[PDB]
Amino acid sequence: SAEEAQLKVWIQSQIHPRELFGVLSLGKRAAKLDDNPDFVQWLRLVKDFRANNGNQAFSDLDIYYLLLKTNSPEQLKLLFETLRHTPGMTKIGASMEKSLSGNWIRKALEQDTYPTIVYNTLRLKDAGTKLDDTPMFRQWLEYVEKYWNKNFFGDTQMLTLFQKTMTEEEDIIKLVHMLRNNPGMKSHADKLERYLLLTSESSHKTMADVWLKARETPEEVFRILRLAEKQDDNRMLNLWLRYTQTYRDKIDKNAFSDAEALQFFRK
């Protein structure tokens, strides 16, 4: 058999699966079992390479983060389901699904493990701009929320991890504004939004575009910036007024005018 002999060649050669993944150009297309015999063969090599060298030689996460570069978390979830229910592939599919299930928070919670450590046990830096779509990231948000309700790990240190995961500020801003949707994080996200706005001029234009795309009301933004608290020489006030006029221009035509906004602020 042509496929059976090719597999032998790779095994005898001791070629590393990352190297083979590259030369077979499996990054150029969807990781599916249909119309992709090169991928199926690649899995067969991975299987054998693990048996002969141990799982750490090419881990679940090595596999996950390689495929994540050119497939979505949702595709990979369905992929591992299919492997778990394909004869010959059941062991590895189940290994992957176990590695991505979340069955570590209870045993790791009580243990009192620093989120930073867990963040890099999970190798979330390797997720890149896909971070906020990965299930493991969502799981880590659970372990942080629970770690806080116990007893120290702070909002700035969380932001540091995000910045060592992806380089572009626009990606960092969209990420933090997506955390608003997670209630219980909404508190800390809003704080990070302010921290960026007070430490980076480039953030202002980007942040205003993110709110505008999300159709956020002037009232909501006023709430994020916490302008009701104690403070015409105020950078945050100017920013809010500029967002408000953009909102009035692009979305409502009937929101706060300049005068009305200033009145709202006086309260």
Residue numbers in the entry: 97 to 247, 251 to 330, 335 to 370
Please give sentences taken from the publication describing this entry.
The P. infestans RXLR-type effector PexRD54 (PITG_09316) perturbs host-selective autophagy for the benefit of the pathogen via interaction with ATG8CL.
Although SDS-polyacrylamide gel analysis of dissolved crystals showed that both proteins were present in these crystals, no electron density for ATG8CL was observed. Five N-terminal residues (92–96), the residues in two loops (248–250 and 331–334), and 11 C-terminal residues (371–381), which include the AIM motif, were not included in the final model due to poor electron density in these regions. The structure of PexRD54 includes 16 α-helices. This is a conformation not yet observed for RXLR effectors with multiple WY domains. Interestingly, in PexRD54, the C-terminal helices of WY-1, WY-3, and WY-4 are positioned such that they also serve as N-terminal helical extensions to WY-2, WY-4, and WY-5 to build four-helical bundles as observed in AVR3a4 (42), AVR3a11, and ATR1. Finally, PexRD54:WY-3 does not have an N-terminal helix and does not form a four helical bundle.
